[PDB]
Amino acid sequence: FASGTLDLSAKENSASVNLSNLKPGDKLTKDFQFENSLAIKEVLMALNYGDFKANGGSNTSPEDFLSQFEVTLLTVGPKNIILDDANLKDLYLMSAKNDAAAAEKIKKQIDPKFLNASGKVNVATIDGKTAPEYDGVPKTPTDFDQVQMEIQFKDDKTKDEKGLMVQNKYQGNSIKLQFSFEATQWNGLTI
């Protein structure tokens, strides 16, 4: 329940998540508060992954395991839902590769006001609105909303011909995630 502090003045801000010893339905939650007074327009989130291990589970595909997870990301001023149960594979391909087909899957749900041309997602809001929605910046830039992230192992509940839970193919699997957060100037370049 302890929030994480991302100092936007820092060179790189990233948060890692270890997905290990989980079972379908499990959720992981983390809060982030930004700190700054640089002229920041956006804070762009992207996802990377790695270190997949089968650990005796029948699945040996890193991507298939990744595809079992969803992320909900919101900001708190009411709560503003930016990403709602976005599939982690789709989010990886969009935000790491700017893959167009993957972006289309996310664009099904997301308000394009949060989507950066690069494929990364803007998570910097002030009372639920992005900074460029405002008519200029005050002499002292307002602190950005708190960010809340929820990662869940989706629970299919599908059985096969043998009556076994199909998602047990992932039993034992582990993988590591890293979410990056990049502050941008008002011209859109990294600070």
- 46's tokens: 């992207």
Task: Provide the experimental method for this PDB entry.
Answer: X-ray
DSSP 12-27: -EEEEEEE-S--TT-E
- 60's tokens: 């040996």
Residue 11 in contact with residue 180, Cβ under 8 Å? no
Which residues neighbour 54 within 8 Å (Cβ) at sequence distance 6 or greater? 60, 172, 173
Instruction: Calculate the CA 124 to chain-centre distance.
Output: 13
Residue 150 in contact with residue 14, Cβ under 8 Å? no
Residue 34 in contact with residue 6, Cβ under 8 Å? yes
Name the residue type at position 136: G
Which residues neighbour 76 within 8 Å (Cβ) at sequence distance 6 or greater? 145, 146, 147, 148
- 32's tokens: 């982030």
Residue 74 in contact with residue 93, Cβ under 8 Å? no
Instruction: Calculate the CA 72 to chain-centre distance.
Output: 7
Instruction: Calculate the CA 167 to chain-centre distance.
Output: 23
Q: Entry resolution in angstroms?
A: 1.9
DSSP annotation of 133 reads: G
So where are the chain's domains? 1-191
Question: In whole angstroms, what is the distance from residue 41 CA to residue 175 CA?
Answer: 32
